[PDB]
Design an enzyme around this catalytic site. Structure first.
Site, short mmCIF file in Angstrom:
data_model
loop_
_atom_site.label_atom_id
_atom_site.label_comp_id
_atom_site.label_asym_id
_atom_site.label_seq_id
_atom_site.Cartn_x
_atom_site.Cartn_y
_atom_site.Cartn_z
N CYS A 1 88.31 59.95 136.22
CA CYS A 1 89.47 60.80 136.02
C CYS A 1 90.61 60.29 136.85
O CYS A 1 90.54 60.32 138.10
CB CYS A 1 89.11 62.23 136.40
SG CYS A 1 90.40 63.40 136.07
N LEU A 2 91.58 59.70 136.18
CA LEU A 2 92.79 59.17 136.84
C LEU A 2 93.78 60.30 137.03
O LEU A 2 93.70 61.34 136.37
CB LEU A 2 93.39 58.06 136.01
CG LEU A 2 92.46 56.88 135.76
CD1 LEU A 2 93.19 55.80 135.00
CD2 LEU A 2 91.87 56.30 137.07
#
Length: 165
Positions: free
Chosen positions: A117-118
């Site tokens: 998850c950026l």
């Protein structure tokens, strides 16, 4: 713009890509893959010259499934993680989703099933550069800074251990 300069500082020696093609796009996809491999191998050479040779990647024959390894150094110890991703049908307008399967369930900055998850700034950054960014840029702007937060955090929390080898 701080964001524009920061992006340029990270990516300006990586060859830019050009072709708007995804996995279904036949000769245009073969051309896009030439661009992807030329950009990746120049990024690797630059990384070696910088003492930061931090990943290897390979693909299946059609270039639609990618897999390999990344390395992260913390307090001089080197940690290795397997990585993989598929190429979306709407690539390169859509960005691929890198997975680090061994960390599934171990970071809050990940989805169920091992996809990293950026931050919310990554997607619009990718979107405003289409179709110039490719897999080398995904590594440099996406996985690289993710590791630089999450691996130190998980080592400190006692989630990641180095194997005595």
């Amino acid at each position: 713009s701080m964001a524009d300069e920061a992006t340029r500082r990270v990516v300006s020696e990586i060859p830019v890509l050009k072709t708007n093609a995804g996995p279904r796009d036949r000769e245009l996809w073969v051309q896009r893959l030439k661009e992807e491999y030329q950009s990746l191998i120049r990024y690797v050479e630059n990384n070696k010259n910088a003492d930061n040779d931090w990943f290897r990647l390979e693909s299946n024959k059609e270039g639609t499934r990618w897999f390999g390894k990344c390395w992260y150094i913390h307090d001089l110890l080197k940690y290795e993680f397997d990585i993989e991703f598929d190429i979306p049908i709407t690539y390169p307008t859509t960005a691929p989703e890198i997975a680090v399967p061994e960390l599934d369930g171990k970071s809050a900055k990940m989805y169920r099933g091992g996809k990293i998850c950026l931050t919310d700034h990554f997607k619009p950054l990718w979107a405003r550069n289409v179709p110039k960014f490719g897999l080398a840029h995904l590594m440099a702007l996406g996985l690289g800074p993710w590791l630089a937060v999450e691996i130190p955090d998980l080592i400190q929390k006692g989630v990641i251990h180095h194997k005595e080898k």
